[PDB]
């Protein structure tokens, strides 16, 4: 049931690219999200996103660090960073883009192959 959400309630079947790397001190760890023609472009503007909302299947992880994309001045791509100050937040991380991973290979829409439920 994991889901990535910009306004929590509003699912993404978009297939970003997730990349790992590491501060601009090497002290905390974090991980970059690429977005490609992402539909919250046409929902809600990009400088109205102050933050992401990821829930995992056990608990759920709120990211303040998102920076839009904008090519020309025209949006198209928005990018998304996560801190791991913490450890046990890297638990839900490699949990989440494992099974992330599985349900979609980088290519596939997560629409279709995961059924929707009323709930949640």
Not at 5 to 25: C, D, H, I
């Amino acid at each position: 049931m994991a889901e990535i959400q910009f306004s929590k309630g509003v699912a993404e079947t978009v297939v970003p690219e997730v990349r790992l790397s590491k501060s601009k001190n090497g002290q905390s760890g974090m991980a970059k999200f690429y977005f490609l023609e992402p539909t919250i472009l046409a929902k809600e503007s990009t400088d109205d996103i102050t933050g992401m909302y990821l829930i995992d299947d056990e608990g759920e992880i709120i990211t303040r660090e998102v920076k839009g994309k904008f090519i020309n001045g025209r949006p198209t791509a928005i990018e998304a960073t996560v801190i791991l100050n913490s450890q046990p937040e890297w638990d839900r991380f490699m949990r989440f883009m494992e099974r992330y991973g599985a349900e979609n290979g980088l290519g596939f829409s997560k629409s279709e192959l995961e059924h929707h439920h009323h709930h949640h």
